[PDB]
Design a protein around this ligand. Structure first.
Ligand SMILES: Cc1cc2nc3c(=O)[nH]c(=O)nc-3n(C[C@H](O)[C@H](O)[C@H](O)COP(=O)(O)OP(=O)(O)OC[C@H]3O[C@@H](n4cnc5c(N)ncnc54)[C@H](O)[C@@H]3O)c2cc1C
Length: 500
């Protein structure tokens, strides 16, 4: 008896999962011949390549637990294998007598390298590998081909391409396993009945004092519930305009499906199909790019450009990226990282980010403009790295693409438009309720200066019980000075890159 193995990495879901579905149908169309091992590999190697913060570790823990629970309902289970894939797969290929391996493809460079090696091993041992592109709606390889070998570098051009492509068939959940025994314990399982169980919170989360509020539980079950909750107001969905949603409402102004899509707890193909059903129903609706479907297409766009460039997450060697002489300022980077800039709106966002692991799109705009071309003149690569640690939705291509946009390094070139760290949040939150919540030390400042506490006299600062320089920092830069200097720096960068 040989085993069929599905390998979860992303695609942490049962629904709309062709790679996992195929494994399950095969076992049921040939009972008695196959064992089924759906595995996730706790790969130590990823930690040398990316930073994971406490909150995102908790999201994965909750996700793996839900995926185990969901598989049990199909008379299977999740097998979480500790160790490096390069060492893990030669062993299990033999100890399990693996006939077929399936997994959802990914475009990240670490994923490509790792998968190429695993496919070289599987070819050696006579293991059949079947891979499926289901993490994105469209296959970036097919988009690039249809555009004659180059990723479209504007959104509109991208949309004109994918409109001519076939939308994939969205699958349901696999059928339960008919009369399948629990595979026999292997070398590892015999010396430890729990060697493959889902990791506890204590095993994944080493810095539990950094966990924030548990607001967005991981797992396919929660993703599907939140998706259904979001689609309940069909008018809100159909008439959604991303630029008009507030960055500083106390409750999120968008779906917060991003962590779920990032891990594949939610199929973006399923979500796209649910959105198209509502739009068909609602004749007055918004259109890309501002619509909710447009938001899914931004994800597809950044995946397509990123698939073409292995250096997508850095400035050097990145075909898309303007070469800009970013400066090193450790003390300013530290203040931004920890929300101690002295600009209450910026600091509020970075504290929401650290505590909760999600901030609104235009909140990301605000703090990203501030760190880079706006105020501090620090590389977007430094902001990407903080975002990588703290975001639940941390996504290699999306973090990089948007950081390049926000820094005027690619895709976006109107760098003379600069967000004010004082005025920007006032439009949607004139009272500063958001600031009061996430910078509570300012909670007694009135609306007239809560965005600009340095406009309060010392006497008043003492009255509000928050003296700048003691209880809340002084501004680390003066926006009105630096952003003008930085516009001139950007123009000189643009000239140098234009001449080369
Ligand atoms: C500096 C910066 C860094 C970012 N890093 C990430 C990241 O690491 N991971 C991430 O998922 N998004 C990232 N984004 C994009 C965007 O901010 C988030 O996708 C969005 O805020 C998630 O909130 P939501 O789920 O309510 O989105 P909604 O507005 O509800 O949109 C639904 C989905 O569309 C996608 N989406 C929306 N806006 C964008 C966008 N601008 N680009 C790409 N996809 C988009 C996501 O899949 C999102 O879940 C970043 C943006 C900026 C400016």
């Amino acid at each position: 008896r040989s085993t069929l193995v599905h390998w979860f990495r992303k695609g942490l879901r049962l629904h709309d999962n062709p790679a996992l579905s195929h494994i399950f149908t095969a076992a049921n169309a040939a009972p008695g011949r196959y064992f089924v091992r759906p595995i996730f590999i706790l790969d130590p190697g990823i930690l040398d390549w990316m930073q994971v913060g406490a909150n995102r570790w908790r999201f994965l823990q909750q996700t793996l637990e839900d995926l185990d629970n969901q598989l049990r309902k199909l008379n299977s289970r999740l097998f979480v294998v500790r160790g490096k894939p390069a060492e893990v797969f030669p062993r299990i290929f033999k100890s399990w007598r693996v006939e077929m391996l399936t997994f959802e493809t990914d475009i990240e460079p670490y994923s490509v390298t790792r998968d190429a090696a695993v496919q070289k091993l599987a070819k050696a041992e006579g293991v059949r590998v079947e891979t499926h592109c289901s993490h994105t709606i469209y296959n970036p390889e097919l988009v690039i081909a249809k555009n004659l070998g180059k990723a479209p570098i504007t959104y509109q051009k991208f949309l004109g391409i994918v409109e001519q492509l076939k939308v994939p068939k969205v699958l349901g959940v696999p059928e339960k396993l008919k009369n399948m025994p629990t595979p026999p314990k292997d070398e590892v399982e015999q010396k430890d009945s729990a060697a493959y169980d889902c990791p506890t919170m204590k095993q994944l989360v080493k810095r539990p004092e950094e966990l924030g509020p548990n607001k967005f539980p991981g797992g396919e079950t929660e993703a599907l519930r939140r998706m259904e909750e979001s689609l309940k107001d069909e008018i809100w969905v159909a008439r959604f305009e991303k630029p008009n949603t507030a960055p500083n409402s106390l409750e999120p102004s968008t779906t917060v499906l991003s962590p779920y899509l990032k891990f594949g707890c939610l199929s973006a193909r399923l979500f796209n199909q649910k959105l198209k059903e509502i739009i068909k129903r609602q004749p007055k609706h918004s259109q890309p790019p501002v619509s909710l479907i447009g938001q899914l297409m931004w994800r597809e766009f950044y995946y397509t450009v990123a698939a073409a460039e292995p250096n997508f997450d850095r400035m050097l060697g990145n075909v898309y990226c303007m070469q800009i002489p970013w400066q090193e300022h450790p003390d300013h980077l530290e203040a931004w990282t920890h929300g101690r800039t002295g600009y209450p709106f910026i600091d509020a966002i970075m504290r929401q980010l650290r505590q909760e692991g999600w901030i609104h799109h235009l909140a990301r705009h605000a703090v990203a403009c501030f760190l880079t071309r706006g105020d501090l003149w620090i590389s977007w690569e430094e902001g990407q790295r903080v975002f990588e640690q703290l975001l639940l939705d941390q996504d290699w291509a999306l973090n990089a693409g948007n950081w390049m946009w926000l820094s005027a390094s690619a895709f976006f070139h109107q760098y003379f438009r600069v967000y004010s760290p004082v005025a920007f949040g006032k439009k949607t939150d004139p009272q500063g309720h958001y600031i009061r919540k996430y910078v509570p030390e300012l909670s007694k400042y009135p609306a007239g200066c809560i965005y600009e506490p340095w406009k309060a006299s010392l006497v008043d600062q003492r009255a509000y019980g928050c003296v700048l320089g003691t209880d809340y920092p002084h501004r680390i830069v003066k926006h009105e000075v630096v952003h003008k200097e930085n516009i001139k720096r950007m123009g000189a960068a643009y000239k140098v890159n234009r001449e080369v």
